[PDB]
Write a protein that holds these residues in place. Structure first.
Motif, PDB file in Angstrom:
ATOM      1  N   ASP A  88      -0.269  10.801  -4.028  1.00 20.87           N
ATOM      2  CA  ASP A  88      -0.202  11.917  -4.248  1.00 20.87           C
ATOM      3  C   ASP A  88      -2.056  12.325  -4.141  1.00 20.87           C
ATOM      4  O   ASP A  88      -2.690  12.263  -4.959  1.00 20.87           O
ATOM      5  CB  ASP A  88      -0.352  12.454  -5.589  1.00 20.87           C
ATOM      6  N   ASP A  89      -2.155  12.435  -3.045  1.00 19.93           N
ATOM      7  CA  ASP A  89      -3.852  12.162  -2.068  1.00 19.93           C
ATOM      8  C   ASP A  89      -5.184  10.861  -2.503  1.00 19.93           C
ATOM      9  O   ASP A  89      -5.787  10.860  -1.620  1.00 19.93           O
ATOM     10  CB  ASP A  89      -4.336  13.271  -3.148  1.00 19.93           C
ATOM     11  N   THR A  90      -3.947   9.709  -2.817  1.00 18.89           N
ATOM     12  CA  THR A  90      -4.800   8.390  -2.837  1.00 18.89           C
ATOM     13  C   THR A  90      -3.733   7.005  -2.357  1.00 18.89           C
ATOM     14  O   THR A  90      -2.649   6.981  -2.157  1.00 18.89           O
ATOM     15  CB  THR A  90      -5.046   8.211  -4.521  1.00 18.89           C
ATOM     16  N   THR A  91      -4.615   6.813  -1.017  1.00 18.89           N
ATOM     17  CA  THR A  91      -3.876   5.459  -0.461  1.00 18.89           C
ATOM     18  C   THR A  91      -3.929   4.357  -1.535  1.00 18.89           C
ATOM     19  O   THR A  91      -5.668   4.101  -2.253  1.00 18.89           O
ATOM     20  CB  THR A  91      -4.342   5.066   0.424  1.00 18.89           C
ATOM     21  N   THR A 101       1.002  -1.288   0.107  1.00 23.30           N
ATOM     22  CA  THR A 101       0.277  -0.287   0.367  1.00 23.30           C
ATOM     23  C   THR A 101       1.357   0.958  -0.104  1.00 23.30           C
ATOM     24  O   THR A 101       2.159   1.167   0.862  1.00 23.30           O
ATOM     25  CB  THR A 101      -0.818   0.446   1.312  1.00 23.30           C
ATOM     26  N   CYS A 127       1.211   5.898  -1.108  1.00 21.79           N
ATOM     27  CA  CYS A 127       0.247   6.864  -0.951  1.00 21.79           C
ATOM     28  C   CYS A 127       0.858   7.494  -3.102  1.00 21.79           C
ATOM     29  O   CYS A 127       2.159   7.795  -2.861  1.00 21.79           O
ATOM     30  CB  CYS A 127       0.997   8.299   0.164  1.00 21.79           C
TER      31      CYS A 127
END
Ligand SMILES: Nc1nc2c(ncn2[C@@H]2O[C@H](COP(=O)(O)OP(=O)(O)NP(=O)(O)O)[C@@H](O)[C@H]2O)c(=O)[nH]1
Ligand SMILES: [Mg+2]
Length: 167
Positions: A51-54, A47, A49
């Motif tokens: 840019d603003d999304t997991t 998992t 990161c």
């Protein structure tokens, strides 16, 4: 960001090109000089990161020996992305990768994102596949290409992240 995405990725390629090493480097930050050949397939998750999304990667690391060829569709059928891996020091492995790309273009999801890894780039003193030739082949076939080194980590996180960005 609070947005979470998940996708299925499959690695394909001739035995010994470094598929398991690439996934181990990306998922566990490890590299094993003595990695044993895979039997059937192995499964791993990571998992990251983006840019603003997991983004959660569900990764099928297939065994590349020809005797496992018939099992490949079980792993690529529902894949949203694939990384076809070859060894930059072995032209035959590059030809084998092109045949995996053809199989994916004809039998996998029509919207699959295909990346091409020219692995073992740390062994450029024994290069057999010209970077520009591979880049041209990838451009002509709409493949996301990068030379990588599971051994040094060169472009390993980058190729996985570039794929996620294009999904
Ligand atoms: N120098 C170098 N050796 C690498 C690299 N990636 C893998 N290797 C080595 O190459 C060998 C085979 O790697 P491995 O990951 O098992 O290959 P594979 O594609 O999973 N083989 P299989 O399909 O049979 O499971 C191992 O000895 C490993 O350490 C790399 O980037 N550079
Ligand atoms: Mg393996």
């Amino acid at each position: 960001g609070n947005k979470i995405c998940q996708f299925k990725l499959v690695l394909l390629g001739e035995s010994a090109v470094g598929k398991s090493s690439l996934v181990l480097r990306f998922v566990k930050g490890q590299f094993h000089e003595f990695q044993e050949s895979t039997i059937g397939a192995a499964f791993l998750t990571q998992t990251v990161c983006l840019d603003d999304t997991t983004v959660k990667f569900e990764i099928w690391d297939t065994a590349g020996q020809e005797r496992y060829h018939s099992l490949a569709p079980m792993y690529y059928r529902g894949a949203q992305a694939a990384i076809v891996v070859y060894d930059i020091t072995n032209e035959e492995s590059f030809a084998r990768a092109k045949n995996w790309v053809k199989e994916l273009q004809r039998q996998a999801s029509p919207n699959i994102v295909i990346a091409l890894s020219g692995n073992k780039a740390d062994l450029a003193n024994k290069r057999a596949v010209d970077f520009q030739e591979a880049q041209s082949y990838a451009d002509d076939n709409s493949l996301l290409f990068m030379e990588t080194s599971a051994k040094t980590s060169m472009n390993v996180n980058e190729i996985f992240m570039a794929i996620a960005k294009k999904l």
